[PDB]
Amino acid sequence: PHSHPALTPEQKKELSDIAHRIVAPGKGILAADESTGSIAKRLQSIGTENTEENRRFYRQLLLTADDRVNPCIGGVILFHETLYQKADDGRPFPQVIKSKGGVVGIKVDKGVVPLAGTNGETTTQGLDGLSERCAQYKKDGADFAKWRCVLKIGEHTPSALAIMENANVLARYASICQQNGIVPIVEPEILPDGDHDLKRCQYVTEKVLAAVYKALSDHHIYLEGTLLKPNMVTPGHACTQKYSHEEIAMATVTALRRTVPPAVTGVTFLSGGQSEEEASINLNAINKCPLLKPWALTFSYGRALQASALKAWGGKKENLKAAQEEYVKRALANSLACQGKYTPSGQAGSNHAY
Amino acid sequence: PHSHPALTPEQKKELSDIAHRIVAPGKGILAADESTGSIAKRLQSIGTENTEENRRFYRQLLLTADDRVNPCIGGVILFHETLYQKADDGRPFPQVIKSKGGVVGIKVDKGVVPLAGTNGETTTQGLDGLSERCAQYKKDGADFAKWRCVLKIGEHTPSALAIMENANVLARYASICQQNGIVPIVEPEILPDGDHDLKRCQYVTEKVLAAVYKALSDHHIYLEGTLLKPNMVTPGHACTQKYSHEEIAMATVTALRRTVPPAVTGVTFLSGGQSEEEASINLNAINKCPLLKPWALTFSYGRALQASALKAWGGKKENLKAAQEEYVKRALANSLACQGKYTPSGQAGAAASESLFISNHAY
Amino acid sequence: PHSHPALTPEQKKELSDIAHRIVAPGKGILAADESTGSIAKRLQSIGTENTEENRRFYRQLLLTADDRVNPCIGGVILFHETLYQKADDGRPFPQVIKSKGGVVGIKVDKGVVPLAGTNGETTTQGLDGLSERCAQYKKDGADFAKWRCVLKIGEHTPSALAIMENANVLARYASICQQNGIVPIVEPEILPDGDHDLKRCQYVTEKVLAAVYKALSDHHIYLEGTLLKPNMVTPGHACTQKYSHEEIAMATVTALRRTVPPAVTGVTFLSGGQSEEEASINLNAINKCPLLKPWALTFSYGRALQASALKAWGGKKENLKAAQEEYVKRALANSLACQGKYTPSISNHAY
């Protein structure tokens, strides 16, 4: 019942300023932190040898897009490798991002591991020596981090154990980050896999987020110095019943209003499989939802921002401008969506049953 | 409400058989898993410099004592380095341990780290890639592991968070070990640091263990395939009030009977700074306590089994036989103590009666 | 991290002594705490009007059975009404029970109530004014109480909420009881209904019991001064797979060894609708199970001890002797069962 301040007024201030910059009006996050494992699938999809040079050139392609993306990208999440790579001009990628007004972020988890005794459920590792890594990363240009936990809806999941364990590990990770000046982005992703309907996802999301925030509270986490990266509340991929973006938005916002304390600075949704347009439309619907939303509701997209750019590139250097144009467009479309000003046009423009 | 078997019957049998072998009647554990930075302080206290060879020699000195320790030692806990070292005859240390009827154990935690928002409290790290390490250690002769969490008694400690967190990580560690055929030794140590009395320590111990076993249940841990390494219940190192060995034994067994399920194959106490003699006398009293004890109550001493040995070695090869003799004597004493058959003499020396206390013991 | 003594050494001694006397070697508990509406079905099956008088006579019939039951009965659970009734000779029932070497118990819960948001799960009520009630019952001859929580094995049950809430209310009830010198018997009954097998039941029993003991620890319960009344681990009623009494015994003892601290003074299994014979045979098997059991393993039977006695009685006073002979016989059988010496007429890792 006694307070033992984990952070000083100055440390809190720094964390809060960073979190706010990442989600400033009209800004979102570019999820370009794909590990060498997932980046292999990306490069293969366009027939491109997964070499370090190719990965650099590709990340360089997104990071050096023209100034149009500046007011769109509040932050960029990088994989360890990329954080130390440089642009052709010799500029460290973190410097590239900063000079364009973006905050640098780094993925710090070490993947999921199987939770024994459960039906295929997992937790996430990566806490060992995390404090030293954050201290280094901070010094090397990063101001926020990313840790991903994965939960799945099934006949017996998310189980009590999975919810509790994942919520606890996220708290530990957030705790270590704040001690090192790094704003932690809490990502408790509930996969969309399955044939469950919309209200099933809203139910599970509500229970998961409540556990997450109780856990952050127990570990004395400074909420204003954090961000939330959840799944939007949608029906299962295999769900036979169909819904409208207004329904998805109402369910999403409702689930958040019931669990996410207003102190949390911002919600940066993950696209989790949605098409580039789908992710933008849904995001726009969420911001236009007629309910009180006390936190920024923006994006933290990977493929929803890179899909077209990746294909337009095809690994061919002569397609650089074409590939960047595609990315720029998604950045602009999502910049409008996170403000609710999105339209297929472009720059020119109950709840009791939940 | 639905069982998703973590272990097959065959896996359980292997874990259960391993755990029982380690704490078979009359047998205990030698804790020689001190980290390079910890063992360095030991060798330093005897004018010996911390070098790979010195560390090897000392461990060999302990692991190759005469066949008299065989009945006394059920298992030996080693640090990563020692596990891959060899004896003068070329035999890997794990092989030496087995040839003497002992089970090989390995420490897998990566030390404690501070918990933000608390008053100097910690939790322990070491889960990352633990599964793969356990599979490798298993292949290299290890059958059980050890992980150490440290809690302290103070005005606001252990806190709710500290207790919950430490219990949860121990459970995660235990879960990964059993998935790799390794018996996890759960060590939730409550330091003796402080001036609190016996009942203060009994209360804290009961809360800690209750929390430990609820977490182990939550994580689907096979208790029969585990061992517990708790602190004995004693007053603070700086406590003014005095207690008899019978009182410490009563408080200890009472605390355990109130929190440890009968399924737990055994309890292997840490010496925690108690003198070699004091550690043996209490273990003896514990086993003589007039209460029902559904689990083996033995030792897992680090300091309490090496105080005299180190001093007798002093870092000189010619003192090899002398140092080993001191080790064998402590092991023999403790072998009896865990059977309630230990009766002090007067040959242990002043070394066995010396306090081995170390503030916030880290290793 | 600081202790605030809930009980004094004297209070602990009293509770501990009461707990031990109830489950002393060979002794068990007669569960005769059926309420008016709960006993209605019994009397109906024997065309006996449910009046206070017939209930008094029926209870008198059991409580005054000959001295052969004395070493068999360590305690008798009474319903409020009965605690205040007297035998024909004018002796209050509590006196009768105590004269025969038994301890008097009293049911204190006020029934189960539905837990909203769940698939038909419940919690139990009865905490309101419980302290005042315990002090009064203690003064009126009672030394232990009974409070029943019910859980069911289903598709989504027992859920985390059901488990947590029932564990918590049980702890509150235990806490209040111990403050009034009453030994609380903790009863987290997992119904046998359903088609689940033996493994399903064992798993749920283990999770439920683990939750019960954590709650008890959190509420500072003196375990030595308590008793546990759990369901035996058995397959569901609609289970097609069949098992031997040695198997359910192994599953029962294994579940208990993994969750019940040795400090608990005793385990008094509930009959849970099993037949008089099945309940006895199972308890016997449980006691013969080749595993270490650090607590007494006895009974707390209702119909398992009354079934034949009730039919023999039939509401006819001239049947007094025949009916008592039936109860006495089951009391003798179960006394032998909790000692593993009853006849109908190594650690296994497969659990």
Side-chain angles (χ1 to χ4, degrees):
Chain A
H2 285 75
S3 172
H4 292 286
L7 302 167
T8 63
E10 297 61 50
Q11 295 184 299
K12 282 180 174 175
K13 186 173 184 306
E14 166 175 46
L15 294 169
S16 179
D17 293 345
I18 296 179
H20 284 86
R21 289 211 296 286
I22 294 170
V23 292
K27 302 188 181 186
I29 302 173
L30 164 58
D33 64 315
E34 300 93 343
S35 61
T36 315
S38 293
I39 197 60
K41 311 169 189 175
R42 296 299 112 67
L43 298 184
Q44 190 190 321
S45 71
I46 59 175
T48 298
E49 185 179 0
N50 181 34
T51 59
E52 188 200 300
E53 235 311 296
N54 283 317
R55 292 194 295 275
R56 186 192 74 72
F57 188 85
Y58 179 53
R59 268 44 183 287
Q60 167 176 262
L61 177 162
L62 299 169
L63 304 182
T64 59
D66 70 74
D67 302 327
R68 280 178 296 167
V69 300
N70 294 20
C72 304
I73 305 306
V76 180
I77 319 178
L78 300 178
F79 175 70
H80 184 89
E81 183 187 80
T82 320
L83 177 67
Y84 294 104
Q85 300 189 311
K86 299 177 180 175
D88 298 325
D89 55 27
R91 289 186 301 161
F93 281 149
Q95 185 188 302
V96 171
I97 298 167
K98 291 182 189 290
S99 66
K100 288 180 68 62
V103 172
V104 184
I106 176 62
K107 184 223 291 307
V108 304
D109 73 70
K110 297 187 175 193
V112 299
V113 290
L115 275 177
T118 63
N119 185 47
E121 292 184 294
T122 61
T123 184
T124 302
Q125 51 165 30
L127 290 182
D128 294 351
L130 178 58
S131 185
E132 290 61 41
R133 294 178 58 205
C134 286
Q136 182 65 59
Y137 290 145
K138 182 65 176 181
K139 177 182 175 178
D140 294 334
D143 293 311
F144 70 93
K146 204 224 62 159
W147 179 290
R148 176 168 176 264
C149 282
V150 181
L151 295 170
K152 190 166 184 176
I153 300 171
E155 182 182 62
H156 304 157
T157 65
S159 74
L161 175 62
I163 292 179
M164 183 291 273
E165 161 51 35
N166 277 284
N168 192 66
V169 74
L170 283 165
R172 283 293 296 129
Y173 141 74
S175 182
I176 292 162
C177 286
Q178 306 199 309
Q179 286 302 289
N180 294 286
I182 293 180
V183 165
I185 293 183
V186 177
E187 182 176 4
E189 169 172 38
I190 299 166
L191 301 174
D193 306 48
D195 75 317
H196 49 281
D197 60 12
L198 188 65
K199 73 171 175 295
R200 174 73 189 295
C201 182
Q202 192 188 317
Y203 187 80
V204 179
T205 298
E206 283 177 22
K207 298 302 177 185
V208 163
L209 292 175
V212 170
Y213 284 103
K214 175 50 165 50
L216 299 187
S217 171
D218 294 356
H219 292 251
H220 315 301
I221 299 305
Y222 177 61
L223 298 183
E224 297 89 330
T226 73
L227 293 184
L228 175 69
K229 179 158 182 174
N231 45 276
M232 293 175 158
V233 177
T234 69
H237 277 171
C239 180
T240 64
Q241 179 181 177
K242 300 182 184 178
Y243 303 87
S244 69
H245 304 98
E246 287 66 50
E247 300 180 84
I248 297 183
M250 184 64 87
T252 290
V253 176
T254 291
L256 295 180
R257 285 170 48 71
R258 291 170 176 176
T259 56
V260 192
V264 170
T265 297
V267 179
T268 61
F269 298 99
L270 59 83
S271 62
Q274 300 175 51
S275 71
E276 303 178 305
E277 207 65 288
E278 193 184 318
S280 296
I281 299 172
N282 280 330
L283 176 53
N284 185 68
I286 286 172
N287 274 273
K288 293 182 99 298
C289 183
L291 289 171
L292 228 172
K293 302 161 261 60
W295 0 245
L297 293 178
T298 189
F299 58 100
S300 180
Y301 298 169
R303 275 165 293 188
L305 273 176
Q306 302 170 51
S308 295
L310 185 63
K311 255 193 60 188
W313 173 45
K316 306 173 179 301
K317 186 176 183 190
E318 62 269 44
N319 295 321
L320 183 56
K321 305 244 64 175
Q324 296 184 306
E325 199 58 46
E326 292 309 304
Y327 163 55
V328 171
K329 288 185 289 183
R330 296 325 311 179
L332 289 166
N334 282 310
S335 176
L336 292 175
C338 80
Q339 286 174 290
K341 301 175 177 176
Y342 179 74
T343 57
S345 173
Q347 190 63 60
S350 226
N351 61 66
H352 300 303
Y354 283 91
Chain B
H2 292 283
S3 185
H4 293 289
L7 307 170
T8 59
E10 297 80 12
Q11 294 180 295
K12 294 178 180 181
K13 188 194 196 306
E14 171 175 44
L15 291 173
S16 186
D17 294 341
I18 291 174
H20 287 74
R21 280 206 286 288
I22 300 171
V23 301
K27 305 184 178 184
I29 298 171
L30 158 67
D33 61 306
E34 302 99 328
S35 62
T36 325
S38 178
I39 188 67
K41 300 297 178 179
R42 299 295 185 293
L43 302 178
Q44 182 174 181
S45 65
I46 53 177
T48 303
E49 63 162 357
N50 180 49
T51 68
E52 156 124 66
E53 182 46 39
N54 284 314
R55 290 196 297 279
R56 188 192 73 72
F57 190 78
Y58 178 63
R59 272 51 187 283
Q60 165 178 283
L61 174 161
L62 299 171
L63 298 175
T64 64
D66 72 67
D67 284 353
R68 280 180 296 169
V69 299
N70 287 27
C72 308
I73 306 303
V76 184
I77 307 176
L78 301 173
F79 181 64
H80 190 88
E81 169 186 286
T82 315
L83 184 70
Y84 291 96
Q85 284 182 149
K86 303 180 180 182
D88 300 334
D89 60 28
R91 289 189 304 162
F93 283 151
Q95 188 183 314
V96 174
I97 296 160
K98 290 184 186 56
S99 73
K100 294 175 70 58
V103 187
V104 185
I106 179 73
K107 186 249 286 304
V108 296
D109 70 71
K110 295 189 179 195
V112 304
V113 292
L115 283 172
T118 62
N119 179 31
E121 298 183 284
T122 63
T123 181
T124 299
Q125 55 167 25
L127 297 183
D128 300 354
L130 183 60
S131 187
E132 289 69 46
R133 295 212 288 140
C134 285
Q136 192 53 57
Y137 289 140
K138 180 69 174 181
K139 295 182 177 184
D140 296 328
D143 283 309
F144 69 100
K146 197 214 67 170
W147 173 291
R148 175 162 180 272
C149 286
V150 184
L151 301 174
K152 184 183 297 190
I153 298 180
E155 280 303 304
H156 314 301
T157 70
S159 66
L161 170 60
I163 298 177
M164 180 288 278
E165 165 49 32
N166 276 278
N168 196 67
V169 72
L170 275 169
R172 280 293 299 134
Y173 142 80
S175 183
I176 300 165
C177 286
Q178 300 193 315
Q179 282 299 292
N180 294 82
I182 291 182
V183 167
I185 289 177
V186 175
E187 187 184 344
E189 193 192 331
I190 297 178
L191 304 177
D193 302 38
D195 71 338
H196 52 282
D197 60 6
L198 188 67
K199 65 170 172 296
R200 177 74 193 289
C201 176
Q202 196 187 309
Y203 175 85
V204 181
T205 299
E206 278 165 40
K207 298 305 182 175
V208 167
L209 295 177
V212 168
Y213 282 99
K214 180 54 168 54
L216 292 185
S217 167
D218 283 3
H219 287 256
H220 314 302
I221 301 303
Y222 178 58
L223 300 183
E224 294 85 327
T226 78
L227 295 179
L228 177 67
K229 177 161 181 172
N231 48 286
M232 289 182 184
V233 177
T234 73
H237 174 70
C239 187
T240 58
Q241 179 171 168
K242 300 287 184 172
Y243 300 87
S244 68
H245 300 296
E246 287 57 62
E247 296 180 303
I248 288 183
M250 179 59 67
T252 297
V253 179
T254 289
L256 299 173
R257 287 167 43 72
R258 285 169 185 181
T259 59
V260 189
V264 172
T265 294
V267 176
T268 59
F269 296 108
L270 55 96
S271 48
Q274 303 177 65
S275 70
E276 305 183 315
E277 193 60 44
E278 189 67 3
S280 298
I281 298 178
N282 286 328
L283 175 54
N284 180 251
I286 286 172
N287 281 280
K288 286 196 299 183
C289 179
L291 286 181
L292 203 56
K293 300 153 294 193
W295 1 244
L297 288 160
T298 188
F299 59 96
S300 180
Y301 299 166
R303 286 167 286 180
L305 275 172
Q306 303 173 49
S308 293
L310 281 161
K311 181 188 180 62
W313 175 42
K316 304 224 64 178
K317 299 175 186 175
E318 54 253 284
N319 296 301
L320 173 68
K321 215 294 173 180
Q324 293 184 301
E325 188 58 47
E326 294 303 303
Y327 165 54
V328 174
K329 298 193 292 184
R330 294 318 313 172
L332 275 174
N334 291 309
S335 174
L336 298 173
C338 71
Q339 297 189 67
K341 300 173 185 179
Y342 179 61
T343 301
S345 60
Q347 182 183 126
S353 177
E354 195 172 300
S355 175
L356 310 172
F357 178 84
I358 309 174
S359 293
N360 312 272
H361 193 216
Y363 74 97
Chain C
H2 294 289
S3 174
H4 288 289
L7 304 169
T8 63
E10 295 69 47
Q11 295 179 292
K12 298 190 184 187
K13 189 186 190 304
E14 174 174 41
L15 295 163
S16 182
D17 290 340
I18 292 175
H20 282 86
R21 293 210 294 281
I22 297 174
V23 300
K27 302 196 180 181
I29 296 179
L30 159 68
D33 61 308
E34 303 87 349
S35 64
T36 299
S38 176
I39 191 67
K41 280 69 68 59
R42 304 302 142 61
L43 305 185
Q44 181 124 56
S45 70
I46 62 177
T48 295
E49 182 171 55
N50 193 182
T51 63
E52 198 197 315
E53 231 316 286
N54 287 315
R55 296 196 295 271
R56 190 195 65 79
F57 185 83
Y58 178 51
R59 273 49 189 279
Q60 172 177 270
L61 177 162
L62 295 168
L63 302 179
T64 57
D66 71 74
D67 282 15
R68 280 182 299 172
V69 301
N70 286 31
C72 299
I73 306 307
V76 181
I77 313 175
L78 296 183
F79 178 65
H80 183 93
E81 181 186 80
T82 314
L83 174 64
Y84 294 105
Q85 295 182 315
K86 306 178 181 178
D88 303 316
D89 58 19
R91 288 184 302 154
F93 287 148
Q95 196 184 306
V96 176
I97 300 174
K98 300 187 180 193
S99 296
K100 292 174 63 65
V103 183
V104 182
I106 180 63
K107 177 221 299 307
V108 300
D109 71 65
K110 287 192 177 183
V112 299
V113 288
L115 273 176
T118 69
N119 185 197
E121 299 183 281
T122 66
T123 187
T124 297
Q125 52 167 36
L127 294 178
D128 295 356
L130 180 57
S131 186
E132 285 65 52
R133 290 177 62 210
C134 287
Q136 188 65 53
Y137 290 138
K138 175 73 177 181
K139 181 182 173 187
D140 292 336
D143 287 316
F144 70 96
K146 200 217 66 172
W147 175 296
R148 177 176 182 250
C149 281
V150 183
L151 296 176
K152 61 170 177 165
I153 300 180
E155 255 307 88
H156 313 313
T157 67
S159 65
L161 171 62
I163 294 182
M164 187 271 276
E165 159 55 30
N166 277 277
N168 194 68
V169 75
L170 278 172
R172 284 290 298 132
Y173 142 76
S175 180
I176 297 170
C177 284
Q178 298 196 315
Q179 286 297 293
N180 292 92
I182 296 287
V183 165
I185 287 177
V186 180
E187 181 180 1
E189 167 162 33
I190 302 170
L191 299 179
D193 308 344
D195 55 48
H196 52 273
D197 60 17
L198 191 64
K199 313 205 315 298
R200 181 80 190 284
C201 184
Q202 188 179 320
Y203 178 87
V204 176
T205 294
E206 277 169 32
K207 297 309 177 193
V208 167
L209 290 180
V212 170
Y213 283 100
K214 177 55 165 59
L216 294 186
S217 170
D218 290 351
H219 289 252
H220 311 128
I221 302 309
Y222 178 58
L223 297 185
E224 291 84 325
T226 72
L227 291 179
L228 181 69
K229 184 164 177 180
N231 47 288
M232 290 176 182
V233 177
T234 76
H237 286 327
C239 180
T240 59
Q241 176 161 166
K242 293 301 175 297
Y243 309 75
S244 59
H245 295 101
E246 288 64 59
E247 293 181 297
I248 88 115
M250 179 64 85
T252 290
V253 177
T254 295
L256 295 175
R257 283 166 46 72
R258 297 173 174 174
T259 57
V260 190
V264 172
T265 298
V267 173
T268 69
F269 295 105
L270 53 82
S271 36
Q274 297 174 58
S275 66
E276 300 177 304
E277 201 65 70
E278 174 178 46
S280 293
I281 294 172
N282 278 322
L283 182 58
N284 187 63
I286 282 167
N287 276 282
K288 292 182 61 183
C289 177
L291 287 174
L292 214 172
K293 289 96 66 183
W295 359 243
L297 293 187
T298 189
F299 60 97
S300 183
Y301 299 169
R303 283 179 296 181
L305 278 171
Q306 303 175 54
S308 293
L310 189 77
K311 285 189 65 182
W313 171 45
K316 290 171 179 49
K317 306 207 291 182
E318 64 276 16
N319 288 171
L320 185 72
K321 252 56 163 298
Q324 297 185 311
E325 200 55 36
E326 293 301 303
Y327 164 56
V328 175
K329 279 187 286 181
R330 299 323 307 175
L332 285 174
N334 287 303
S335 181
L336 286 178
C338 70
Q339 302 191 77
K341 300 186 169 301
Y342 177 71
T343 54
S345 175
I346 307 175
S347 56
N348 203 296
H349 308 114
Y351 294 70

